[PDB]
Design a protein around this ligand. Structure first.
Ligand code: ZN
Lengths: 74, 121
């Protein structure tokens, strides 16, 4: 019946705010001066993860995000 | 009678919209192009970002897909249904790929045919 008074356990956990990125320019690279696009990111080797999807490049490892398939640099 | 490109485009885009297709925005339009599910591309003019338009020409050229260069991207937003709310809202859509044929599986209108007739020459 009393108030929670839960100030002992944390000061309110912040929720996640996704950082806003403008476009997907960094993925493709035409700029060959000869209309030759070069893909700056690997693509996924899964069946439902064809040419459209790509795979992220952290300081190590390659990560998909769609099927969560990971290839460590090593 | 006369069915010039700037009036058959509205018909074909709408008719696709009833039957899916119409990959709006640079994302998922690049996906349709790379996945080779695209049959027509509609890039809008007056796009400030040069890399945007240059990359979409690159994609269309390498994938050997026709490209229409309309102006006033807001009009493209009207045409692809981004407006809604009677005739308010109106977000710009400066690129769109017509998946599953230029037309759609529902109907094959001659307004689709004028597009390929104009693109053949
Ligand atoms: Zn994947």
């Amino acid at each position: 019946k009393k108030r929670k008074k839960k100030s002992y356990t944390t000061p309110k956990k912040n929720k996640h705010k996704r950082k806003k990125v403008k476009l997907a320019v960094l993925k493709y690279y035409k700029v060959d001066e000869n209309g030759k696009i070069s893909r700056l990111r690997r693509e996924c080797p899964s069946d439902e993860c064809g040419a459209g999807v790509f795979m992220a490049s952290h300081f190590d490892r390659h990560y998909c995000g769609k099927c969560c398939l990971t290839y460590c640099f090593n | 009678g006369v069915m010039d490109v700037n009036t058959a485009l509205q018909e074909v885009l709408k008719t696709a919209l009833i039957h899916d297709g119409l990959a709006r925005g640079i994302r998922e339009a690049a996906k349709a192009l790379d996945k080779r599910q695209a049959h027509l591309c509609v890039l809008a003019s007056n796009c400030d970002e040069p890399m945007y338009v240059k990359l979409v020409e690159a994609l269309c050229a390498e994938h050997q897909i026709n490209l229409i260069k309309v102006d006033d991207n807001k009009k493209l937003g009207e045409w692809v249904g981004l407006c809604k709310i009677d005739r308010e809202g109106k977000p710009r859509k400066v690129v769109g790929c017509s998946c599953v044929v230029v037309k759609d599986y529902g109907k094959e209108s001659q307004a689709k045919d004028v597009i390929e007739e104009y693109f053949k020459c």
